Design a protein around this ligand. Structure first.
Ligand SMILES: Cc1cc2nc3c(=O)[nH]c(=O)nc-3n(C[C@H](O)[C@H](O)[C@H](O)COP(=O)(O)OP(=O)(O)OC[C@H]3O[C@@H](n4cnc5c(N)ncnc54)[C@H](O)[C@@H]3O)c2cc1C
Ligand SMILES: Cc1cc2nc3c(=O)[nH]c(=O)nc-3n(C[C@H](O)[C@H](O)[C@H](O)COP(=O)(O)OP(=O)(O)OC[C@H]3O[C@@H](n4cnc5c(N)ncnc54)[C@H](O)[C@@H]3O)c2cc1C
Lengths: 346, 346
């Protein structure tokens, strides 16, 4: 059949390294991700420097996502993006059937749940036809600090990530505006006092009411603002717009599944130090995995993934070795290394 | 006193990441390594490509040692190189005294044992004054493939690690010689048959009996060979000499200690999923740590190290958080990020 050895639900660090290590151990591997892009929660902070991945000199999240996606695809898994896994069923023969929000079905000998803290969607701007500018200069994350160098940015919404974004764009942007719909910027008073003594201009009881494209482009050239307590309707020229109205979560995967998988605190999968859940051949890796030695770092996701994959290989092939062969000596990389070495000699 | 918070014994991946994460959590950190150079077992294979470190695109061991050492020194720990720790003593107050082969003493609130598989020294060539040529062209490891491009190398010894080197130098070197003192090349018949089908010339019952330097330099220009069954004494011009007569191990650290530490299989530290040993404030990380979920990868060294450090911080400061703050938002990196961002904006 179309029966995979290992199917990975989720495309963040845990899922990607599962796909990678599953390929290192020569299993037919699939990875299913909700978003149209792989990478996981790091898409929430692609502009920050990341210092605590073992062996990485500091990189931005954006560059880290690049490296992880490349590593996850080394063995060319079946990649199913734009797909919400809706439920997991354990068949009587012991294999698994994954049902997507479409009803489409996937089949696997083992499943590695790497859904992290779930499906995150940024809450969209409820302005008529605002999606036109998503392809240009209407953002829901700070994709990179350089993107905003010398530009004029307005941030809609307060608190959440808003105060933190403004504080890191203040020394980079030409000007930073913040518009909040309440009275006080809903952060913690530690970082809101630096925001107000510095080069950020705040508008309270205001919201964006129309995105005005250029007569020459389709980028946002001006923005219309509206006061909720006085009533004034002003216009403002900007180079970039960033929306921060929060995130929507979807964690329904395991509730919607008929599986006696043990769950901690109504969300996390109750696992052991080897990433095993209470259902045979169903493993958890990454933020979804909870056990007494779970390390709440990206570095821990790699360990969960490797432990999960190593268990899956022996579930499928009992006489398989219990540990994967070190990459430095694994012939699985012979041809790939061949070209890399040929470039190393100039 | 000179009482450190965390002292790390061993400077490989586990030790290096312990020092880093110990610095991330703002503890006075020391790291002690036997060799003149940090890096650990990766120095045994600095010429190989490493694919399975989470988030690293394939890089050589040489480059990985570079990256790990830089990360391990991020917070400028006290680095004691060229130093063998001989024993660990638990003081009455619960702190620790580490005694070096000199008798010098180090003091710590916690110890993180990251000694891997022990102190490794390559078995030296027992030829009079052969160490003169170590600084020139007599090597005991393949430091890099490019070093040997288009060169003529003689490799002494015929063990399984001898055969592996020749097979990766065959398509790079101009010519490869292999000399073994026994009758049959004591590898496994899988790669020993590949050795003989190519441009590698083997000499059996042979060993080097004198190294002949250049009259103009002091590198080895010719090498003297001797047949152990015929008796011939031939001479051979070579560019590089590589000795592979095996390694000497030193694992006496935990036998020499009067410490009630639980040891598995007469070597490993018997730990839990949080890198705790049976002695309070004494942690183990990396290849020395054994427990049911230990991952035998560099990737696992990072998890062991992080879990150990997080436990040490709470051993030293009970009210400290049990998880270290994520690097992407940790003010401890403010000044360093300041400089990096200034370079990122051109
Ligand atoms: C703001 C912030 C900063 C951080 N900074 C650091 C740092 O500096 N260093 C560090 O080590 N860690 C950091 N972390 C932690 C790090 O983000 C997590 O450890 C890591 O992202 C967890 O990886 P994961 O793959 O387990 O989960 P995730 O990264 O959340 O990946 C889950 C993926 O699976 C998808 N998914 C979920 N449910 C489904 C479904 N039903 N069907 C299909 N796909 C689904 C999601 O869309 C997502 O793409 C930070 C976290 C946050 C929130
Ligand atoms: C040939 C080979 C290839 C490998 N390839 C891979 C690969 O591709 N991927 C992968 O993930 N893993 C690989 N590994 C495994 C990897 O090398 C180990 O997982 C890793 O080195 C463990 O790190 P460590 O810091 O725990 O131990 P080590 O690397 O052994 O570090 C221990 C350090 O402590 C020092 N030390 C020991 N005793 C003392 C003492 N008493 N006083 C002071 N210092 C002391 C030692 O000199 C050494 O520097 C490979 C291993 C080998 C042997």
């Amino acid at each position: 059949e179309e029966l995979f050895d290992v199917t990975v639900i989720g495309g963040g660090p845990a899922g990607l390294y599962s796909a990678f290590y599953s390929g290192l151990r020569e299993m037919r591997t699939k990875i299913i991700e909700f978003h149209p892009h792989l990478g996981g929660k790091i898409h929430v902070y692609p502009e920050k420097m990341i210092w605590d991945v073992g062996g990485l000199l500091p990189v931005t999240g954006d560059k880290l996502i690049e490296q992880l996606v490349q590593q996850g695809l080394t063995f060319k898994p079946e990649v199913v993006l734009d797909t919400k896994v809706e439920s997991i069923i354990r068949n009587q023969d012991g294999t698994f059937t994954l049902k997507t929000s479409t009803g489409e079905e996937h089949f696997s000998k083992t499943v590695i749940v790497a859904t992290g803290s779930g499906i995150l969607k940024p809450q969209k701007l409820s302005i008529e036809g605002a999606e036109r500018f998503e392809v240009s200069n209407l953002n829901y994350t700070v994709k990179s600090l350089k993107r905003f160098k010398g530009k004029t940015v307005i941030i809609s919404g307060g608190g959440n990530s808003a105060v933190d974004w403004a504080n890191e764009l203040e020394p980079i942007a030409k000007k930073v505006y913040v518009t909040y719909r309440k009275e006080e910027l809903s952060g913690h008073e530690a970082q809101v006092k630096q925001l107000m003594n510095s080069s950020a201009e705040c508008f309270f009881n205001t919201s964006i009411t129309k995105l005005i494209a250029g007569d020459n482009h389709e980028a946002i050239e001006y923005v219309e603002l509206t006061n909720h307590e006085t009533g004034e309707v002003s216009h403002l020229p900007i180079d970039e717009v960033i929306i921060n109205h929060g995130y929507e979560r979807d964690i329904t995967l395991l509730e919607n599944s008929e599986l006696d998988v043990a769950i901690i605190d109504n969300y996390y999968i109750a696992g052991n130090a080897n990433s095993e859940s209470s259902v045979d051949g169903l493993y958890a890796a990454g933020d979804i995995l909870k056990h007494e030695g779970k390390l709440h770092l990206i570095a821990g996701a790699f360990q969960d993934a490797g432990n999960a994959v190593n268990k899956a290989k022996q579930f499928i092939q009992p006489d398989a070795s219990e540990y994967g062969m070190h990459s430095s000596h694994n012939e699985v990389f012979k041809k790939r290394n061949r070209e890399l070495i040929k470039q190393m000699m100039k």
